Design a protein around this ligand. Sequence first.
Ligand SMILES: NCCCC/N=C1\N[C@H](CO)[C@@H](O)[C@H](O)[C@@H]1O
Ligand SMILES: [Br-]
Ligand SMILES: [Br-]
Ligand SMILES: [Br-]
Ligand SMILES: [Br-]
Ligand SMILES: [Br-]
Ligand SMILES: [Br-]
Ligand SMILES: [Cl-]
Ligand SMILES: [Cl-]
Ligand SMILES: [Cl-]
Ligand SMILES: [Cl-]
Length: 836
Amino acid sequence: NDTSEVMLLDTGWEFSQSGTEKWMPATVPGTVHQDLISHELLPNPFYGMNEKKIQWVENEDWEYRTSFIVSEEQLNRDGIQLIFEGLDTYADVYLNGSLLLKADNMFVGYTLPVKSVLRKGENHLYIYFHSPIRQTLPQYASNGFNYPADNDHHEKHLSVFSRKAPYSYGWDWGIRMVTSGVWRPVTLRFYDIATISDYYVRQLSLTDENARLSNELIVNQIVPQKIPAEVRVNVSLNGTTVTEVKQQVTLQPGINHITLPAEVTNPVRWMPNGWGTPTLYDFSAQIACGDRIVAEQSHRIGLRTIRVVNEKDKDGESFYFEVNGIPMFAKGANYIPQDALLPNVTTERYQTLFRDMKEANMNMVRIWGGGTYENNLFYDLADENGILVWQDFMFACTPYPSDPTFLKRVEAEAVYNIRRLRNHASLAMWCGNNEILEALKYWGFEKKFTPEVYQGLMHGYDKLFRELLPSTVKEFDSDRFYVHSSPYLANWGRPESWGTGDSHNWGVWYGKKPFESLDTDLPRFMSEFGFQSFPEMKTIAAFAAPEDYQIESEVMNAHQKSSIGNSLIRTYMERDYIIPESFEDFVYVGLVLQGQGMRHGLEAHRRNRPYCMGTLYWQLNDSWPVVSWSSIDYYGNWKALHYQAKRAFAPVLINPIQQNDSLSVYLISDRLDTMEQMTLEMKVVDFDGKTLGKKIQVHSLEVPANTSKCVYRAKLDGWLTPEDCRRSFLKLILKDKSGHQVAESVHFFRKTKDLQLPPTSVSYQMKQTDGKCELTLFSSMLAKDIFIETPLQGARYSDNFFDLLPGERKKVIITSPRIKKGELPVNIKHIRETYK
Ligand SMILES: NCCCC/N=C1\N[C@H](CO)[C@@H](O)[C@H](O)[C@@H]1O
Ligand SMILES: [Br-]
Ligand SMILES: [Br-]
Ligand SMILES: [Br-]
Ligand SMILES: [Br-]
Ligand SMILES: [Br-]
Ligand SMILES: [Br-]
Ligand SMILES: [Cl-]
Ligand SMILES: [Cl-]
Ligand SMILES: [Cl-]
Ligand SMILES: [Cl-]
């Protein structure tokens, strides 16, 4: 919003495999792999078994070029700046015969002064990407040991040497595609006098009465004269000015530091999803020289406090978030990259993923450390959806080097991304890495390395995670929490450690523990736990053949990367369900299983507030069509788990929990207000619809804000017979004084495999128009865990993976832009259908 002119360098690019002298059109931002695919120079890397057939790319070097025109009038501007938001990774940048940059960190943006190198007329930009494998082979050869990075799918674990997305080398839900390229935008800015290098809105204090801010600017003045200027900051809300402040300065050549206080009286606070509005102010900083605004930069700013409380207490050491002074139970998931090829993730895909977290009642996301520091749009969407962000630095599972050069590269990326992200309302904390200290302690090592190399790794840990990173946070983001590792102390095999900080409870899945264990094995905060599923059939059809459907088949094992995969799924399924004979039915029941088991954990964590203060499941999403722990597949289809997470995260939840042949019912609220004069009503209904016994009523209930409380206990014995338990379910509703329903739940008394489910038809009527299909479903008898299956990729449902209750009609709306007036194919599956 100033006199500068920005040229986007996003057209006219060509690329070439080094040594071929053969050039073709490219798409920038982009990746080498996509550029090849677009010219049918590579097969669909996600299809079938194309993974092995695409690996060759990682051994070549790749060159990119573009030309552009500069006019005499542009060449005459005071300054001209070329900005690379992202280069993956070892890139030699040449412009007009000048080596401008030898890039070496995927996570750093580079700002380059180029006016003295540009020419009137045609200009030639030329980028040389060294193979990150061949670049680091000599480095590895000199190292004399292989770092234990099991997720790096190569004999030589080269990932640890490069500041490049860890997942790109492979992971336990991911394809190996060690790509290269101009992965974020390239801009040329022509400007006068100065640019704003950094604008930081630093909150000094916040009360209901006043927010005090400090506007900290860094201005890079490019001309040799002293330049009188006036710095102005405008604070607005919804287009209307709230306050305005200004400061006279004379800008000196080079860097200038400018600080302007501003205050907002009676500030409208940013609140997280579920507690109100994610209000964002617009803060705009301008540099005005005479009549002209030579430089402007704005941020959207949310006014709130976030405190992470991590303190010794009677239970061990707490780990929770206090938002605007109120302890906030965290509800969310771990986020991984949305694609093997990052530039392929569109604005639309980011918007939809946030819609998916918001609609599932989430208030937090963990950006896990084997991915990337996300793009600005991700954090912008987190801001406007009221989702808190836990940001790992990009270190995961393995110890890393700690030599001076390496720590210099890391320092660059830490400074860059902290300054990049620190104005976001959503940003809640930093975490040095995923599971490295656990790895060092327990994985085990010290049987794997000499004592000397082991000691070096231990000192190397401290240098990076207990010194460099926490110092950098203290300097550049001094009011945000940092912890050196997640989990920082708790280990899932060591019950004595569970009351200390956050847990990754991998007892379920890796430890083979039943889902019931989640009721007893409680953390102070669950930062990971999870369970895998095959994605639904239309997703399998994007990647496998009917031949290719047994699963531990070649491909159906090729698409599983956990240490066991599809073995474990069957093992757990047998505990609770009849294992279906057909592959398609097995896929359906596996979705149901992951949903039901995980939901039982999310409920245990909320039920056990305040001992437990959060649950973030592993994992939200997928990077490609694969078998994984995700609740949303690569094509955006919600698995059962996503619907179940939405239910389990509902602001008010009725939670029936049955153990030791007894039922308790808890009422769980994350509301900010207390509910008074409430009635819990329950009744036992058989699978034919017939009420058994009488309604049970619990009157005069209070549901206080932000609490979980037991309101009802009954022994099963004397109430229902073992036969009644396999033949009926419990219906529960909660209502206010007048009889308006605020919540409902259903409860089963036995495992699904033990239920005497009746054969039944789910019939439906359909009303189909452009973009929309409204179905009304009916079954005279219980239909268990119904799946409404359509072939349309990414179709959205008002509900799915729910029990259709006997004789009770249920409306479901299906939407997709592909739905054309004039029949959407619909296949309704339910549990009884899967066996005979
Ligand atoms: N020793 C095996 C236990 C690893 C637990 N951690 C994770 N599990 C996920 C699924 O396996 C994995 O993708 C992530 O790195 C995560 O931190
Ligand atoms: Br310049
Ligand atoms: Br510059
Ligand atoms: Br200064
Ligand atoms: Br919330
Ligand atoms: Br620390
Ligand atoms: Br029981
Ligand atoms: Cl502590
Ligand atoms: Cl060794
Ligand atoms: Cl239960
Ligand atoms: Cl069950």
